[PDB]
Amino acid sequence: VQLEQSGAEVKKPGSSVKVSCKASGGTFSSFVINWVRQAPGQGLEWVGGIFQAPGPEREWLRDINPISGTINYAQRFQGRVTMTADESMTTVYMELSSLRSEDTAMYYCARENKFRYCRGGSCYSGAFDMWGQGTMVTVSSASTKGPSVFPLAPSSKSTSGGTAALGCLVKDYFPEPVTVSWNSGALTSGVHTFPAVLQSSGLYSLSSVVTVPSSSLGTQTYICNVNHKPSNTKVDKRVEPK
Amino acid sequence: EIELTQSPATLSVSPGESATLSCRASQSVSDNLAWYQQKPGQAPRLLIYGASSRAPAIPGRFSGSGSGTDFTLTISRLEPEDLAVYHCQQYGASPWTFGQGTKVEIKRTVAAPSVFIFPPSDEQLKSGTASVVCLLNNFYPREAKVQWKVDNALQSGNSQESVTEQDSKDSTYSLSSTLTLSKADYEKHKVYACEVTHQGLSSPVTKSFNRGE
Amino acid sequence: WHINRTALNCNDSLHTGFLAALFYTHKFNASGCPRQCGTIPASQVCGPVYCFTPSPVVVGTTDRFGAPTYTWGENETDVLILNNTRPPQGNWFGCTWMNSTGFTKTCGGPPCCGSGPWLTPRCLVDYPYRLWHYPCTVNFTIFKVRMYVGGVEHRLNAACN
Ligand SMILES: *[C@@H]1O[C@H](CO)[C@@H](O[C@@H]2O[C@H](CO)[C@@H](O[C@@H]3O[C@H](CO[C@H]4O[C@H](CO[C@H]5O[C@H](CO)[C@@H](O)[C@H](O)[C@@H]5O)[C@@H](O)[C@H](O[C@H]5O[C@H](CO)[C@@H](O)[C@H](O)[C@@H]5O)[C@@H]4O)[C@@H](O)[C@H](O[C@H]4O[C@H](CO)[C@@H](O)[C@H](O)[C@@H]4O)[C@@H]3O)[C@H](O)[C@H]2NC(C)=O)[C@H](O)[C@H]1NC(C)=O
Ligand SMILES: *[C@@H]1O[C@H](CO)[C@@H](O[C@@H]2O[C@H](CO)[C@@H](O)[C@H](O[C@@H]3O[C@H](CO[C@H]4O[C@H](CO)[C@@H](O)[C@H](O)[C@@H]4O)[C@@H](O)[C@H](O)[C@@H]3O)[C@H]2NC(C)=O)[C@H](O)[C@H]1NC(C)=O
Ligand SMILES: *[C@@H]1O[C@H](CO)[C@@H](O[C@@H]2O[C@H](CO)[C@@H](O[C@@H]3O[C@H](CO[C@H]4O[C@H](CO)[C@@H](O)[C@H](O)[C@@H]4O)[C@@H](O)[C@H](O)[C@@H]3O)[C@H](O)[C@H]2NC(C)=O)[C@H](O)[C@H]1NC(C)=O
Ligand SMILES: *[C@@H]1O[C@H](CO)[C@@H](O[C@@H]2O[C@H](CO)[C@@H](O)[C@H](O)[C@H]2NC(C)=O)[C@H](O)[C@H]1NC(C)=O
Ligand SMILES: *[C@@H]1O[C@H](CO)[C@@H](O)[C@H](O)[C@H]1NC(C)=O
């Protein structure tokens, strides 16, 4: 019914990672479970696929059976990716070894039905019709570190007409993600929490800004709630005028 | 392997108009071609399999056509929800390969950015570093140029910027640029300015402050 | 007889996996679990077609006048003429097959009540595709049985509950 993948992973270069894809509402039986990866900005890349045989082949139909081997890997990953399934066929794993920084990517599992339809002596696929939510895999030499949170104080230099901008700078953390809310989720409108940027230091940095009526400065209290779960770091920063 | 070229790289379409995406394969892949929709921060979703056969629950405005090498995805009446990256994939010959994706953003009227500048905090200065943030708020289109000047010296290679995804109601973008200096360098200098160039501005806008004033 | 005489107009739109179970022998778990025999168009048929004179026999595609065709039933004029495997004497004849979207179809059957391969409410004729057409009979027990119709002796295997 639905594909649920394991949680985000952070790995040092040269290491290995093992990501799981679990079926809810049934079994992977008779499907190919594929793995597709997507480097942070880039397009999709097939890693390989593993077929979950419902049972022994009926060999009088061997010549038109569309399955060519239970396990297929893209050439780029041969020798360092292993795909397995448990005997229940409710979980398929992808283990990727000798990790490199270019292996940093979101890893999706996706179900493929190679027996979508048949006609005239051959059967055709339904493509990748059901996708897991993705498992982010970060490959970096950096060590886990909670952010420093600094105010982005409103000023005359951050007002236009009757509206002011203020924010929080969330600097020097590893790894992704952080969450930022404002006033414990009470203000969401007008908030821009920018995509983190990876600094040359290997640590990430992010700002979160919000626009508010200028007549609220020094009357309304503004707190950014920063949560960096990988380092167990939570910070509430009051942001007030210059 | 089979090479899939998607064109154009970016599409800007006004709501209610049609979007035509192209996907061209090196060798022939014979209707074994699929289209996926990837909305911001989400997993890819299947729209079309077998070049023209349409996945269930996919609205009728999505149509794929073609065979062999030249394929097209047509989005007839565009809704703002259709903001996404569209990927084509061939499964005619292993290994399966994907195009590089076509981003479809929502066309809207041009809007100049509101430009805000933030000096480093005193809390950060005592840590040894100064980050100066220039904020470009709610502009369209996404192309924008930020340039930093410190006492009129052009800064290059010591700033980084981030752009938000297009806003779902506004159809607008925002941009943050952070200039990073040491505390010592920060205090050797007076005028900090970011200069913003954008199609909605008659000429570049500069927002600046004088340190300690 | 030829592989190509199997009608192969198969369509698993809902991704149930029934079409995969044509190519592999798929056993079920507990959770998952008249009319006369004329001429059916191959377009409505997926996988092999069995008829039962008690004894099981396969029907291959032909044209409308009974000459064998070898186009996997893709031809609009391709049919399975079930009645041409009806033995000239004996009052027992049923058939079973899968329609295009994975629903088991039956044209009775035992003289009576039962339908197709079924001999009693308890028992049906065993044949190579029983578990595909009747997956919920996976843990039926297999008995060697013997039946007489029209004087002729039929030796077959029956699956019984
Ligand atoms: C989809 O299915 C259709 C079938 O419905 C199929 O069409 C057949 O195609 C094959 C191959 O191209 C044709 O085969 C040729 O047959 C030639 C003889 O044709 C005459 O005889 C046929 C059989 O007649 C017997 O059976 C009928 C029915 O019981 C009976 O009435 C007769 O008296 C006789 O007993 C007959 O069906 C056919 O009828 C068609 O044509 C007549 C006259 O044109 C027309 O009036 C009809 O209305 C009907 O359209 C005709 O009377 C045969 O000579 C020929 O052999 C040549 O080639 C081979 C190989 O090169 C050589 O060895 C040989 O020496 C000859 O050079 C060949 O075997 C067959 O006739 C078609 N059937 C029909 C009904 O058209 C399609 O191909 C299928 N399509 C796909 C996608 O696969
Ligand atoms: C393969 O074989 C299966 C099994 O027979 C075929 O599926 C059947 O196809 C026939 C012909 O189309 C349909 O009549 C059967 O489904 C339907 O019956 C419906 C009755 O449902 C009730 O509830 C609806 C709710 O919307 C009410 O509106 C109705 O009034 C009914 O009270 C009817 O609604 C549908 O319109 C339809 O007639 C259908 N049965 C099953 C199990 O699906 C299948 O089509 C065959 N496949 C092929 C391609 O040959
Ligand atoms: C039973 O069903 C099978 C599957 O449908 C049938 O196989 C089909 O047979 C037809 C015969 O007309 C083929 O159609 C032609 O295929 C040729 C292929 O030629 C290539 O290979 C040869 C041999 O090495 C080589 O010399 C050539 O240079 C080619 O590279 C094409 O050239 C023709 O254009 C035409 O497409 C089908 O391709 C074939 N399909 C499959 C999947 O095998 C078989 O004919 C049926 N048997 C009977 C008795 O009817
Ligand atoms: C498989 O079965 C499905 C459902 O029976 C068919 O779906 C139909 O597709 C056509 C053309 O795309 C539509 O015009 C119909 O409205 C669809 N029916 C519905 C209501 O789902 C499908 O064509 C069949 N064939 C294949 C090869 O998938
Ligand atoms: C049939 O018996 C088997 C084998 O012991 C059991 O595993 C299976 O679940 C049963 N199937 C059903 C329909 O319960």
Author numbering:
A (entry chain H): 2 to 52, 52a, 52b, 52c, 52d, 52e, 52f, 52g, ...
B (entry chain L): 1 to 213
C (entry chain C): 420 to 452, 491 to 569, 597 to 645
Lines from the paper:
The HCV genome encodes two structural proteins, E1 and E2, that associate to form a noncovalent heterodimer, E1E2. Potent bNAbs isolated from HCV-infected individuals predominantly target conserved epitopes in the front layer of the E2 glycoprotein. The majority of bNAbs that bind to the front layer are derived from VH1-69 genes, which are also associated with bNAbs that target conserved epitopes on influenza virus and HIV-1 envelope glycoproteins. Among bNAbs isolated from a chronically-infected individual, we found AR3X, a VH1-69-encoded antibody that included a CDRH3 with a disulfide motif and an unusually long 14-amino acid-long insertion in CDRH2.
The 2.2 Å AR3X-E2ecto structure demonstrated that, similar to previously-characterized HCV bNAbs that recognize the neutralizing face of E2, AR3X binds to the conserved epitope in the E2 front layer. The AR3X CDRH3 loop contains two cysteines that form a disulfide bond, as seen in multiple other E2 front layer-binding bNAbs, and the AR3X CDRH3 adopts the straight conformation we previously described in the HEPC3 and HEPC74 bNAbs that were isolated from an individual who cleared HCV infection. The tip of the AR3X CDRH3 loop interacts with the same conserved residues in the front layer of E2 as the CDRH3 tips in the other HCV bNAbs. As also found for these other front layer-specific bNAbs, AR3X’s contacts with E2ecto almost exclusively involved VH domain residues, burying 1,250 Å2 (98% of the total Fab buried surface area; BSA), with the CDRH3 accounting for 44.5% (556 Å2) of the total BSA on the VH domain. However, in contrast to other front layer-specific bNAbs in which the CDRH3 plays a dominant role in the interactions with E2 envelope, the main contributor to the AR3X-E2ecto binding interface was CDRH2, which accounted for 48.2% (602 Å2) of the total BSA of the VH domain, with the majority of the binding footprint provided by the CDRH2 insertion (45.4% or 567 Å2 of total BSA of the VH domain). To our knowledge, AR3X with its 31-residue CDRH2 represents the longest CDRH2 among antibody structures available in the Protein Data Bank (PDB). Instead, the AR3X CDRH2 forms eight hydrogen bonds with the E2 glycoprotein, four of which are mediated by AR3X residue Arg52g (AR3X-E2ecto: Pro52c-His445, Pro52e-Thr444, Arg52g-Ala440, Arg52g-Phe442, Arg52g-Tyr443, Arg52g-Pro612, Asn52n-Tyr443, Trp52i-Tyr613). Similar to other front layer-specific bNAbs with a CDRH3 disulfide motif, the first cysteine residue of the AR3X CDRH3 (Cys100a) hydrogen bonds with E2 residue Cys429. Three additional hydrogen bonds (AR3X-E2ecto: Arg99-Asp431, Arg99-Asn430, Asn96-Asp431), as well as a salt bridge between CDRH3 (Arg100b) and a CD81 binding loop residue (Glu531), further stabilize the interaction of AR3X with E2.
